[PDB]
Amino acid sequence: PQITLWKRPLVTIKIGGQLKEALIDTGADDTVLEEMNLPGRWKPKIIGGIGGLIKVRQYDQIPIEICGHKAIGTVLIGPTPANIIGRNLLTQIGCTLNF
């Protein structure tokens, strides 16, 4: 749909059989979710933001649904205050910025 930015762009997403809240973040290269259990092997990955770099866990080819749109891609797990949906998944559901 069309989401305004008066408030944080939090939408529902589903991963596994679980409903979660996540932020549509055009400023995130990657998708970062709050600590949770995911299937299969992982590899380490260093990411950064204001504040510095940080090492987190990287899981690949993870099915995820965002506002009813299915996507598959890399998901990172780390100490984030919120579930973040980044550009790697946003492009997959055809999400764009407009003004």
Add this chain to the structure above:
Amino acid sequence: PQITLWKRPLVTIKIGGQLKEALIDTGADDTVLEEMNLPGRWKPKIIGGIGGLIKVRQYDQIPIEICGHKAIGTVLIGPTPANIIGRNLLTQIGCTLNF
């Protein structure tokens, strides 16, 4: 315009009579810019990002332009890796997410 997310949404902004590249960040509550110069009162402020915290200078009622679109609001100046446009200004230029 309509901006896809295959690459970082960098756009031209103008502040203090100077043009610059800045990231359209729907995941940012605030607007933070790389060390520069600004007028009027400023007061410190600590803010958090994915790698920890940084102390910045908060400036209120700062006129700024994004792609020539006028906005006025709070702007933080500090050691950020890159200029970040937050929702506080994006709402002001009618920027929305679509998919």
